[PDB]
């Protein structure tokens, strides 16, 4: 019948702070070799990844780092740590597309070793999502939002300047088949057709990426123009080496990498028909970070609490 003030209840709030960088130059704070991960049984937290502040913070940090460096540079793993009185929640559900509810919540103090890599049309050297293929977007109905494809298995890319850029044909074909079947699962009927970029300049048309020294702008249209009909008939149009003839912008070096993510965009066909045309896009570079930051949110501890009881 009377209130009681408890100092010690496990209550958190969803505020936001200015997290500080950590490293294992502007320099950062220490990165510990252990997690405070503690599973919170019997709780479900309503996550959200499109309303995160960490992405903007890391975009600012990357911009500042590139300004300070300026060629090229060696990226390093960067941890993000929260100040005293705050915690980083983490989602463990494997089919979590990025938003909505979650289970198996675990609390942590500092994130893992994110790599600030900038690439277009192919998320290179990214973290590998397990289980199945992941498709994420902001507003899927709209055709003005880039679709992010998280791949289950890596695909090797090997490119060398004497300029060649080589991929395995069979593995990439299987990966595209998986992407097509997943997208057909997400899009009822409406046989999917893949196309290249339409009319951009020599900078947006091609796949632009960075490795040792120079910038590689690579004509990708030779690895597209496939089709995926309704039932099962994904069929494309030699040798297992597929090569990209492409150009260099500012020898005998090779930079190997993985293709772990796709950045697609849905063409505004307007007319219905029975086809949805997808072309690789770009524009934003905050998506390069959102693939490994879709499970972290920052929570504020509110230790005080009140509760009624028979305390006389």
């Amino acid at each position, epitope marked *: 019948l009377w209130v009681t003030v408890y100092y010690g209840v496990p209550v958190w709030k969803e505020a936001t702070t200015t997290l500080f960088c950590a490293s294992d130059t502007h320099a950062c704070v220490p990165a510990d070799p252990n997690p405070q991960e503690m599973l919170l049984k019997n709780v479900t937290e309503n996550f959200n990844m499109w309303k995160n502040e960490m992405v903007n913070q890391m*975009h600012e940090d990357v911009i500042s780092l590139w300004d300070q460096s300026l060629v090229s540079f060696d990226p390093i793993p960067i941890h993000y740590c929260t100040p005293a009185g705050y915690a980083l929640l983490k989602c463990n559900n494997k089919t979590f597309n990025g938003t909505g509810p979650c289970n198996n919540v675990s609390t942590v103090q500092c994130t893992h070793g994110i790599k600030p890599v900038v690439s277009t049309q192919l998320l290179l050297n990214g973290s590998l999502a397990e289980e199945e293929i992941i498709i994420r977007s902001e507003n899927l109905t709209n055709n003005a939002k880039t679709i992010i494809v998280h791949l289950k298995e890596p695909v090797n890319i090997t490119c060398e300047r004497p300029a060649h850029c080589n991929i395995s044909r069979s593995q990439w074909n299987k990966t595209l088949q998986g992407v097509g079947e997943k997208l057909a699962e997400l899009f009822p009927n409406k046989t999917i057709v893949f196309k290249n970029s339409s009319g951009g300049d020599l*900078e947006i048309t091609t796949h632009s990426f960075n490795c040792r020294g120079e910038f590689f702008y690579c004509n990708t249209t030779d690895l597209f123009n496939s089709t995926y009909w309704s039932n099962g008939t994904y069929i494309t149009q030699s040798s297992i080496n597929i090569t990209l003839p492409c150009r260099i912008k500012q020898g005998q070096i090779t930079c190997i990498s993985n293709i772990t993510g796709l950045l697609l*965009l849905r063409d*505004g066909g307007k007319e219905a028909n029975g086809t949805e045309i997808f072309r690789p896009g770009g524009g*934003d570079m905050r998506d390069n970070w959102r693939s490994e930051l879709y499970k972290y949110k920052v929570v504020e501890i509110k230790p005080l609490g009140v509760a009624p009881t028979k305390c006389r």
Partner: antibody
Amino acid sequence: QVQLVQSGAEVKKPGASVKVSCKASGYTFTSYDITWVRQAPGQGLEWMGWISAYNGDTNYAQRLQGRVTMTTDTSTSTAYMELRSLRSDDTAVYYCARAKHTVLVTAMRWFDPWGQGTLVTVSS
Amino acid sequence: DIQMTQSPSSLSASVGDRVTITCRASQSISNYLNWYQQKPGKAPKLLISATSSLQSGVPSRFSGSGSGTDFTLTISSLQPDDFATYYCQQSYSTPWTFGQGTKLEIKR
């Protein structure tokens, strides 16, 4: 924080030359480009061109054949724009802005900050 | 060259009303298109980039939509500080042509 400061409004004779300065503050001037755009009394903004503060490359409009010369000073971080052979239709307010990044060039494609603008009036 | 054609030249409405500005292109430009707001006297400022992909601005009052060859800027409620001219600029190809602009009036 980040601001571009222009020169005062000038009046010039026909056939003369006009030189306008643009000072940048609050950021690393060598890490972006600088573009200039004119607005005549009335309606409409016409893109004159842009130049790189790091490489020094310049790209002008096709109508402005050779009447436009554009340079930078890194130590003072100031961009200078020079228009020769003025015509009676050249009276306009000129604004200096930054175009994009130099390296990460496929993401920012907007003119983020703008100067107050310099009014250039030609008359006899 | 790619041309920018803004549907309205001048429109008037009341405070809190929703005004839609339509900007069209002669060629497909994917989703590369920015919007500038020019107050009288002052230089125009960026308000929506690539259909709302900015970093610090974009107050929760403007919105952008559309892709391909037509695009739309939508207001939720007009306010007295909105007297300005809006311009749609392309960023697809080197000719970064602007729109002739639409002057927005608010009725009182």
